[PDB]
Amino acid sequence: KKVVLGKKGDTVELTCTASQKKSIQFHWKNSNQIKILGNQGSFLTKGPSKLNDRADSRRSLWDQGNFPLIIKNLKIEDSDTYICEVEDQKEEVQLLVFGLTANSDTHLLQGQSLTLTLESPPGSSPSVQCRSPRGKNIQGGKTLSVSQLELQDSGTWTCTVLQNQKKVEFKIDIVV
Amino acid sequence: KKVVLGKKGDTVELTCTASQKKSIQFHWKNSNQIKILGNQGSFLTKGPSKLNDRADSRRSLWDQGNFPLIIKNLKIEDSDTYICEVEDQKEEVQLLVFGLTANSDTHLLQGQSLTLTLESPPGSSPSVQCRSPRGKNIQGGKTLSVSQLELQDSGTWTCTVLQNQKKVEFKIDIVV
Amino acid sequence: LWVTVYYGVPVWKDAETTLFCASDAKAYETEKHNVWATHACVPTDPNPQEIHLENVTEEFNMWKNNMVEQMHTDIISLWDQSLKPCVKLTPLCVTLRLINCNTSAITQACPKVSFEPIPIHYCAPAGFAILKCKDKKFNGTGPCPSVSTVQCTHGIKPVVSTQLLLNGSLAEEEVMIRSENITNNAKNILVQFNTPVQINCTRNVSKATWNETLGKVVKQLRKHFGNNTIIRFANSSGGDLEVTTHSFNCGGEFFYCNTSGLFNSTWISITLPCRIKQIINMWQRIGQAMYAPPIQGVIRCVSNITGLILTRDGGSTTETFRPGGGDMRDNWRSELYKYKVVKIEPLGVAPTRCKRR
Amino acid sequence: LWVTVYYGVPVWKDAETTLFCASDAKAYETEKHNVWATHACVPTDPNPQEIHLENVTEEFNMWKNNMVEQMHTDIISLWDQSLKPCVKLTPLCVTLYRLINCNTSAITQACPKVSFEPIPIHYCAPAGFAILKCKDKKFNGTGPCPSVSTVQCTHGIKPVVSTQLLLNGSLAEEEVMIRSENITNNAKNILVQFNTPVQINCTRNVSKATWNETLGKVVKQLRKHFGNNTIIRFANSSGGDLEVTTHSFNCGGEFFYCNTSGLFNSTWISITLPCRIKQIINMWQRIGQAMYAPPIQGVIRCVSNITGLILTRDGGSTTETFRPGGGDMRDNWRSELYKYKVVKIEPLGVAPTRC
Amino acid sequence: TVYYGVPVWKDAETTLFCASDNVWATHACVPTDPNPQEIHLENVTEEFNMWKNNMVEQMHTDIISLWDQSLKPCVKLTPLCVTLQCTNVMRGELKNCSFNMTKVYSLFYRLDVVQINKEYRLINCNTSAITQACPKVSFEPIPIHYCAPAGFAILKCKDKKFNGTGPCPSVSTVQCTHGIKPVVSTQLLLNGSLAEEEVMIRSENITNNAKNILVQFNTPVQINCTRPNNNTRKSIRIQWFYATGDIIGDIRQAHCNVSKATWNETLGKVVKQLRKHFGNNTIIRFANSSGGRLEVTTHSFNCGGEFFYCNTSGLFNSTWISITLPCRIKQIINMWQRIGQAMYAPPIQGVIRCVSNITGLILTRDGGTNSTTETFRPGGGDMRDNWRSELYKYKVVKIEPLGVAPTRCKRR
Amino acid sequence: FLGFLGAAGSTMGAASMTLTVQARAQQHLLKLTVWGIKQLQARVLAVERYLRDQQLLGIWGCSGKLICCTNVPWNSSWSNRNLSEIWDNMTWLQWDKEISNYTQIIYGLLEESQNQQEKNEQD
Amino acid sequence: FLGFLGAAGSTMGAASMTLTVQARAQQHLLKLTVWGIKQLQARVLAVERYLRDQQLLGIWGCSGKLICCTNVPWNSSWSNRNLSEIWDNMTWLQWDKEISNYTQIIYGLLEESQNQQEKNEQD
Amino acid sequence: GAVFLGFLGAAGSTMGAASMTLTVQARRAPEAQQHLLKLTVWGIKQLQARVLAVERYLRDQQLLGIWGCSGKLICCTNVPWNSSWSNRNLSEIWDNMTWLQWDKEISNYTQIIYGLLEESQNQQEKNE
Ligand SMILES: *[C@@H]1O[C@H](CO)[C@@H](O[C@@H]2O[C@H](CO)[C@@H](O[C@@H]3O[C@H](CO)[C@@H](O)[C@H](O[C@H]4O[C@H](CO)[C@@H](O)[C@H](O)[C@@H]4O)[C@@H]3O)[C@H](O)[C@H]2NC(C)=O)[C@H](O)[C@H]1NC(C)=O
Ligand SMILES: *[C@@H]1O[C@H](CO)[C@@H](O[C@@H]2O[C@H](CO)[C@@H](O[C@@H]3O[C@H](CO)[C@@H](O)[C@H](O[C@H]4O[C@H](CO)[C@@H](O)[C@H](O)[C@@H]4O)[C@@H]3O)[C@H](O)[C@H]2NC(C)=O)[C@H](O)[C@H]1NC(C)=O
Ligand SMILES: *[C@@H]1O[C@H](CO)[C@@H](O[C@@H]2O[C@H](CO)[C@@H](O[C@@H]3O[C@H](CO[C@H]4O[C@H](CO)[C@@H](O)[C@H](O)[C@@H]4O)[C@@H](O)[C@H](O)[C@@H]3O)[C@H](O)[C@H]2NC(C)=O)[C@H](O)[C@H]1NC(C)=O
Ligand SMILES: *[C@@H]1O[C@H](CO)[C@@H](O)[C@H](O)[C@H]1NC(C)=O
Ligand SMILES: *[C@@H]1O[C@H](CO)[C@@H](O)[C@H](O)[C@H]1NC(C)=O
Ligand SMILES: *[C@@H]1O[C@H](CO)[C@@H](O)[C@H](O)[C@H]1NC(C)=O
């Protein structure tokens, strides 16, 4: 179950390889067997989904046997399984996409509580340990509440998505 | 033996029959085996008879299988049997002609005898049944003596002369 | 139990052979399609000796055909040589899994010339013959009850169109809908109309003729389906603009006509807003092309609508079929369905009825 | 006695199939004759093979020969291609005895002045067939030929249309010959072949005392069939359409018809013939009429030799009179190919070799 | 017992036909086949002697036959030879001639017209009727492939060291020969096929003085000659006969430009190979044309339908121990050394520029001067060798797959 | 002369007999010469195919003959079934599918059996 | 094909001895293409006819043998004369006439011979 | 059409390689320069080659059926195998001698070889 995590608004890459190198018909199906994207000859047709503008494919590599699917401006509901059937195999790919951001815009002072928002996706077992390089190796779930705001409480380190021994990186917006 | 009858100067249409409908060489012969009319490919030739200036055939009908013989301005001495030679038949047809005229065109009185002239073909057995509009079916020889001239004596007669059950309408000049 | 060998028996076998085209090219027209036909295509057969075969059961597979791919390549050669892209951009885009990769631009001679698609028959070479099953109830796979051997196929126009097949063949009995595998989506729908649907393009589709054909196609679908979950035509799915729009070329100009209005009927005269774009993507191969601006002359194009392409959608009620296209192989499949190349082999194998040593 | 099969035994059976034409057509001549020849014929073989046969007797019947029909149909096609009548009438007279007007259809065609020059033609049987040729000079037209020889392609025939006088080919080998289906029957034509050609010149005229000598030879041959009595006589042509009454032929220019009374006016115990070019003809190919353009102003001269005669005797009642009246062109083509028969090879057999 | 189907070749003779890509130089020959098949033959050593080979003999027959066919189509000039009253007009050596037609003036060179008795006339017009060169036709050489009819194969020897004789390592079967340039050239070859980097000399008998020596250079050398002549052309009736016209400007002998360095280096390779053939210790020399019949003495070639005789005796003469060059032109003709009719080529209007590459050269060894000097005077005049040089690698063969070989067999 | 095609889908046994005696203006010239040559190619290709077939039958030990029998066994793995039913309700076209995967095998075995037969006859 | 009848008119024995061994500008362009097409069609017809005859002889078992003996005996119920008289007095030309009334039996034995040979090979 | 072949490897080695080869053998007109008629002409040449090939094959097959082979690639006769002509060792003429030069060595008398073969078949004829 290969899985990727996006930044919930960034451009993420999903590829299924065809070792035959022929640029043949392919499509993309979701967990509900709804078409989302594929080719027809040498063109690109987007399936009738809710991600038509949101996702697209890299046409240039079709001749060389690579048929990807690239989604831009990601969001929480995009987290679902996808399938390639380039000749007959049903190569599956798992996608669990969600981001972590802040909610306390300006009402913050010395000692007040800050709030964090995590898009918890249904049907997953994650453990968020988003940290900073300046010294905030904080452990928390949804809300990131700290009693004191020192110099070691800001920045962005490698976010530990921790979904089946896989790690990614994305941004945390806090500056001092 | 088919027999046709003439009126001493009219047209007579003797007929052959082409069982193949191919317009193949034929020749019209007489009882003395003298050629009168003949086909040569798609042309038309006349043998050395007494009808060279008289004989004629409707050329257009040959291709459909009809090979007619036309003898315009028929005369009594020309009354002879004629034979087709279409492919192998010796189809023999006979032509008989005799002219009923009046030697006294106008020299006649009320009750004066009348003389008729029947230029019969020699070697023939006509049966002169003059079917006259007076009600007098005259059975006589060459001449018919009319011993009375009445006002009813007008009108063209039809002296139907039978010969082996061969009849044909006749228009003789009897006008008053 | 000793096998013998009989000879001369009638045995056919499927095979792949190169085919030669027989187009009736006048050869005295400046239009490039005709001169190409003189360039690589022979003239048509003087007299076709079609031999009917009776009591023959032949498993026809209209999707596992060879003529479609051969004529695919040949028509690519047509479109490259004739309608030369005077600005053509193609990604050579060499590999080294991600790799940055390049696009090359080629310039050419660029004349604005009318494209007249005269029929291009395809004839099998010597030693092989094509088979056509003449049953009007072919469903795309299985035995064709009546089969006849021929040397040259019926004249095909090398039309290029999307979402609407143009200048194509006509079905005899019913407006047939054919798919290789209808039970599940992602496989195209190919439709053949009994009656041509006239269209007018200038710089309109006659109603009460398209509507009855839609009634016929929904009747056929409900025949294939269970008479419930009524099929209704809907919008184009989306993606590349060419597949979403009715794209066709006649007279050297690319016309992209929005067809949403005609696919806006729910089943239990109309004018089309056509457009012209200088930038295209060739059906032949991945890339983009730039062409000369259109000529000022008003272009009147009248072409019969003969085929229609749909796509199914997965469901957990009423069916919705989206217009499809862009796979020109499927396009000429709709016209060359009833054809199959075959090679004859008189040699055969026998039963055991012999003892000779 | 055991049946054994032999392959290649010399066995033939008479049978007709379509023969193929062979002409050394130049193909660079605008005259429609060479155009037709190059369109529907093949070049003659440089090495025709003729194997003589010994101790063999075959029965030849030129009158019932059917290759002549093939040649006649082919020349009808040739004439339809070459001479295009620019006024053409053809009787239809559809029949359901002059039942209808039988109005002639009035096709009008192009009217070009194209030269019509005869060229030699050969007929070769298709592969698997043979064309027997009777080399015997005493062949009286029908019956057995004591000596025969096989050759695939017959001698070059010039297809020449003409009435009352054959010309331009088919010279007799040794003696003047008389041929007829039935010499006693008057209707059947009598073909006469000349041992020596008499040159005839016609201009926009025949050599005398050579015509007389050939006529004397012909009357000798005729008396050989007759009882040496009943002195032969020639006279006025019989009568009918102009084409049969007078010598009709064409040479490059327009066909013309020439009075032949001077040619046939002798009773056997330089001659100039008045000739008139006409544009109104009766088509020999099929029943009908045609009209042609006026002839070219340039002087047209034709040189030919009268190699043949067609005569029909008068009916019997004394003396015998012969008149020239040959119009059915099948007769002209029977004269040229009187000695050729199509035959099929059947090289198999059965013999009792007792294993 | 017989072995049907076995590949065997017996060297045969067959009449090959044209393959060309009004002008008689390009007559209606068959077009060159589109995909000339070529099958290599491994481990096949085929005996060759292109001096005696059947292909060279039958190719001489075919070449002679085609030249005979190709000469006739042009019209003739049989009766025009009459008495001519002419006056002479770097000596120009041009005579203006008048002949009484009711008088007409034409221009002839000194060499084409000799004195008769001032009074002038053609050399052999009375003896051999002169033929006019058709203005429509042009004398141009094009590559002419040769194709064997059905049932015959063409063998090609792809060996650099071949020399035209002896066993050949690699051979191939080809339907149509490579393009042959029919070029008229004496004691020299023009625009022929490029040879191997090593220089080949070929001779039927190296010791024999009678047998010619033919040498093919590795690298083509430029031979372009120009005749700066502004001539015109006249319509003099015999039927409109068309002859030389008046002249404007000054005449120049056609000067040919050759690079001295590359010519010297090519003949240096040539003398190296000649030392190989005749002994390195022996000293080899070169001399001018030997002499004899005027045509064979000088190099004879054609450009623009006009024949220039390069008797540049200095060029062939290269004395050794082992630039611009002038030439004449001629209007009277003895082609293929035929004793029959002599056709006449009138001049073409405008300058004549001829550009070509030297590809070969022919000499004749002097009788032996034994081991002291080996003079190789330029020899030629036989048009057989020119076509012979171009196709040294080609031969004709027939297949007779009917081998018989002794194997044990009893059967019945 | 060719016998390329024949009877249709029918009892292969009956067709077994049928073969035995079954068969043993011009407007533009450029259209004729380029099309007639194709049909002539078809005829000559059929002739060459017949010659190749006869050659292969000969190297199998039976040239010329149309119904050739020689000693070679019917292997059980070659879709063995009741012979009678193949004779009644089976045709050559349908039966071609059932033996396609064994055709090269049977060709090879018949070939080496012919080689063995000729070797034994010679020696 | 027309070579064979060269032996006609000779005694059947000598004829069969001979049978043992019998053969042991646009002007040029149009000449090459259409004339060639027809000339070559003739040759193809020739070879096809010869192949048909060879095939017919092959069905009888005597493939490629000019002379051969088949095991079926001569039908002697119908009138037939002695062998020595047959081979000497007559010649092949009128020998077709003696069997012309057998033409139906000809068509019989021509098929019957092959039926016998195939029944021997099948049994 | 079996007259077409180019493999000539068995010559130096054993002839038996040629025996395997023969057994294995047993089992667009651009009109730019009027290329249409050109393609027709070249097709005529090729088809003429094919028909001459089949005619040549039949010509050889008639002769091969004159002897007791009639189409068999590997024939068998009862004539003596050499011992009177090219009396070289069988091993060297079957395993070392090149096929072409072997065929020349034979063509020294190949005509009389064919004559004796015909005599052999004649003797086999009417053996009874
Ligand atoms: C499908 O089949 C239809 C036919 O049913 C076919 O339509 C045809 O298209 C051609 C191409 O445009 C039409 O030909 C036109 O004819 C007119 C009148 O002769 C010409 O003037 C046109 O050429 C000029 O066009 C410009 C004027 O706007 C000029 O400026 C320019 O210089 C050209 O010279 C043009 O050739 C033809 O009339 C129709 N036939 C019909 C409508 O019946 C169609 O092309 C086929 N294919 C498709 C994809 O539809
Ligand atoms: C029988 O065979 C003879 C063999 O001589 C044959 O004679 C030829 O007849 C023609 C027509 O009468 C003769 O007339 C002319 O000959 C010249 C020179 O060859 C040609 O140029 C002529 O052709 C043109 O003539 C017109 C001149 O203005 C053109 O307008 C016209 O279109 C023609 O193109 C014409 O042929 C000819 O000389 C003789 N001789 C030969 C050798 O041709 C005769 O026709 C044959 N048939 C019969 C029934 O006699
Ligand atoms: C072509 O026509 C075919 C008709 O034969 C269509 O058949 C499709 O076959 C697939 C098989 O892969 C069906 O998918 C399901 O497969 C499961 C397999 O068992 C378990 O696997 C999955 C995970 O992989 C799991 O989610 C399941 O719940 C199971 O635990 C079966 O159990 C299902 O019953 C079903 O077979 C498709 O459903 C089936 N199609 C249809 C319409 O039923 C095929 O779809 C056609 N293809 C195209 C492109 O048209
Ligand atoms: C077509 O008909 C055959 C007949 O048995 C059937 O097997 C096949 O599934 C059908 N295909 C479709 C797409 O309906
Ligand atoms: C007779 O006329 C023909 C023309 O058809 C001519 O060739 C021939 O020389 C003339 N003379 C003889 C004796 O045939
Ligand atoms: C002959 O022609 C030349 C060149 O045109 C001219 O110079 C010369 O004067 C002419 N000769 C006579 C005698 O006119």
Author numbering:
A (entry chain Y), B (entry chain Z): 1 to 176
C (entry chain A): 34 to 129, 192 to 298, 332 to 396, 413 to 460, 464 to 504
D (entry chain B): 34 to 129, 191 to 298, 332 to 396, 413 to 460, 464 to 501
E (entry chain C): 37 to 57, 67 to 134, 150 to 162, 171 to 185, 189 to 309, 315 to 321, 321A, 322 to 397, ...
F (entry chain D), G (entry chain E): 519 to 542, 561 to 659
H (entry chain F): 516 to 542, 557 to 657
Quote what the paper states about this structure.
The HIV-1 Env glycoprotein, a heavily glycosylated homotrimer containing gp120 and gp41 subunits, mediates entry into host cells to initiate infection. The viral entry process is initiated when gp120s bind to the host receptor, CD4, at the CD4-binding site (CD4bs) located distal to the Env apex on the sides of each of the three gp120s. This triggers conformational changes in gp120 that expose the gp120 V3 coreceptor binding site, which is occluded in the prefusion conformation beneath gp120 V1V2 loops. To investigate the role of receptor stoichiometry in CD4-induced conformational changes in HIV-1 Env, we designed soluble Env heterotrimers that can bind only one or only two CD4 receptors for comparisons with Env homotrimers binding either zero CD4s (closed, prefusion trimers) or three CD4s (fully saturated CD4-bound open trimers).
For HT2, designed to bind only two CD4 receptors, plasmids encoding BG505 SOSIP.664 and a tagged BG505-D368Rgp120 SOSIP.664 were coexpressed in a 20:1 ratio. Subsequent analyses of the CD4–BG505 HT2 complex were confined to the 3.9 Å class I structure. Binding two CD4 molecules induced an asymmetric, partially open Env conformation in which the gp120 subunits resembled open (for CD4-bound protomers) and occluded-open (for the unliganded protomer) conformations, whereas the three gp41 subunits were structurally different from each other. Asymmetry of the HT2 Env with two bound CD4s was demonstrated by variable interprotomer distances: the measured distance between the two CD4-bound gp120s (protomers A and B) was consistent with the open, CD4-bound Env conformation, in contrast to distances between the CD4-bound gp120s and the unliganded gp120 (protomer C), which were slightly smaller than distances between CD4-bound gp120s. Thus, the HT2 Env adopted an asymmetric conformation in which the distance to the central trimer axis was smaller in the unliganded protomer than in the CD4-bound protomers. The unliganded HT2 protomer did not show V1V2 or V3 loop movement to the extent observed in the CD4-bound protomers. In summary, the binding of two CD4s to BG505 HT2 resulted in an asymmetric and partially open Env trimer composed of two CD4-bound open-conformation gp120s and one unliganded gp120 in an occluded-open conformation. In the class I CD4–HT2 complex, individual gp41 subunits adopted distinct conformations despite nearly identical conformations of the two CD4-bound gp120s. Despite protomer C being unliganded, its gp41 most resembled the CD4-induced gp41 conformation, with a helical HR1c, disordered fusion peptide and a helical FPPR. However, partial outwards rotation of the protomer C gp120 still enabled interactions with the neighbouring protomer B HR1c.
